Design a protein around this ligand. Structure first.
Ligand code: 7PD
Length: 167
């Protein structure tokens, strides 16, 4: 048993809810929250900007030190950093950004990072301002992630479309 509440079960391991991932993280304090990161860990907008704002910019300060030491992530890659006030850990995962012309085939590689963690609170990778079709992102998630993933979908309209179109 875990602390996640109000989710619809899609598969053996994937669950979904209409929720603001920031408010969900604050309530649950999951072991792992996933950030929709870019390779520079510049948390300006979308999910990343919202998570970072909720940490009072401490996520950005930590991220800047990580990049100064290690250089940028790969598209499809990830790093584990602090979860600050939101979670034990934040898994920063870089899905391809369609609005930058990145290969959508990298979305599967991005979701493979989730398999290193038994349970995660996550957004749909490459959705929102990353430009991919969220229906596609949910299909890749279900067909790639084998660990237990709790998906938070901010937009109620999109949530209802994801559920009602799910195969
Ligand atoms: N689940 C989810 N929650 C959010 N909350 C925000 O404040 C901004 N963006 C998102 C998002 O893209 N997904």
């Amino acid at each position: 048993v875990n602390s996640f509440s109000g989710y619809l079960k899609l598969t053996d391991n994937v669950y979904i809810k209409n929720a603001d991932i920031v408010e969900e993280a604050k309530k649950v304090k999951p072991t792992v929250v996933v950030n929709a990161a870019n390779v520079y860990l510049k948390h300006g907008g979308g999910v990343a900007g919202a998570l970072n704002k909720a940490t009072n910019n401490a996520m950005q300060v930590e991220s800047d030190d990580y990049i100064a030491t290690n250089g940028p992530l790969k598209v499809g890659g990830s790093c584990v950093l602090s979860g600050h006030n939101l979670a034990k850990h934040c898994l920063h995962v870089v899905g391809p950004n369609v609005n930058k012309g990145e290969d959508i085939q990298l979305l599967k590689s991005a979701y493979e990072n989730f398999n290193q963690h038994e349970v995660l609170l996550a957004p749909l990778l490459s959705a929102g301002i990353f430009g991919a079709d969220p229906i596609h992102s949910l299909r890749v998630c279900v067909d790639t992630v084998r660990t237990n993933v709790y998906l938070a979908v901010f937009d109620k309209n999109l949530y209802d479309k994801l559920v009602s179109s799910f195969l």
